[PDB]
Every structure is written in C-alpha cells, then in structure tokens.
Amino acid sequence: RYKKPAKMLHEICIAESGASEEQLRTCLDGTVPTAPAAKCYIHCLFDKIDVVDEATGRILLDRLLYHLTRECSHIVTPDKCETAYETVKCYFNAHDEVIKFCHLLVLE
Numbered sequence: 001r002y003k004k005p006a007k008m009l010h011e012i013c014i015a016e017s018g019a020s021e022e023q024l025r026t027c028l029d030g031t032v033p034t035a036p037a038a039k040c041y042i043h044c045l046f047d048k049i050d051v052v053d054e055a056t057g058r059i060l061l062d063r064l065l066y067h068l069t070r071e072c073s074h075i076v077t078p079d080k081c082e083t084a085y086e087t088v089k090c091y092f093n094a095h096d097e098v099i100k101f102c103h104l105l106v107l108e
C-alpha cells in the first residue's frame with residue numbers, strides 16, 4: 001500500500017465507465033477529467049470504496065478521509081457521474097491534490 005490497491009481500483013473503473021486512458025490522462029496537469037465517460041470513472045471509484053450514500057447519493061467525504069468537507073459532501077445531481085465530478089471539482093480544487101491522486105491511480 002498505497003500503490004497496489006489503487007492500481008486494482010483504476011483497472012475496474014476504466015472497464016465499467018468505458019473511459020479511455022487519454023480521457024483520464026488529462027489529470028496529469030491537475031485538470032479534473034471532463035469527458036462524460038471520465039466523470040463516470042470518478043463515480044465508479046467512490047462506489048468501489050463504498051463512499052456513495054445509499055439514502056441520498058451524496059459523496060461521504062468524511063468517510064473517504066479515512067471547512068469545505070461539509071459543503072462538497074452534500075452535492076446531489078440527477079446523474080451519478082455528474083454528482084461525483086461536481087464533488088471532486090468542489091473538494092479537490094488545488095492542482096497539487098488532483099496530480100497526486102492522478103499519479104497514484106493512473107501511472108505505473
């Protein structure tokens with residue numbers, strides 16, 4: 001850990017969402033991927049680590065952790081992929097955080 005579990009997580013979510021490596025690789029400069037399929041990849045990551053609220057569909061950011069946590073953890077849209085994308089946009093606003101998760105999941 002942490003590299004072995006995250007690689008395991010990346011391969012399943014590429015397959016489920018149907019997002020290309022090119023679409024996800026946009027994260028390398030700190031950008032949160034925007035493809036309709038890459039937004040679903042993010043939902044897949046939250047679903048596999050069990051941080052998607054059964055009752056509301058909101059992302060349980062406090063659980064994910066192990067001032068901004070509260071607002072970003074109450075975002076709910078009619079689309080599961082849009083909900084996950086909007087939550088990441090809200091919470092991981094700094095370029096450095098996106099890059100760190102990008103490297104952990106996406107590179108060898």
Ligand SMILES: CCCCCCCCCCCCCCCC(=O)O
Nearest residue numbers: 002005006027045088092098101102
């Ligand atoms: C690259 C997408 C944008 C920002 C990142 C979104 C949050 C993804 C969270 C996945 C973290 C994986 C770490 C799991 C490690 C473990 O369980 O031991």
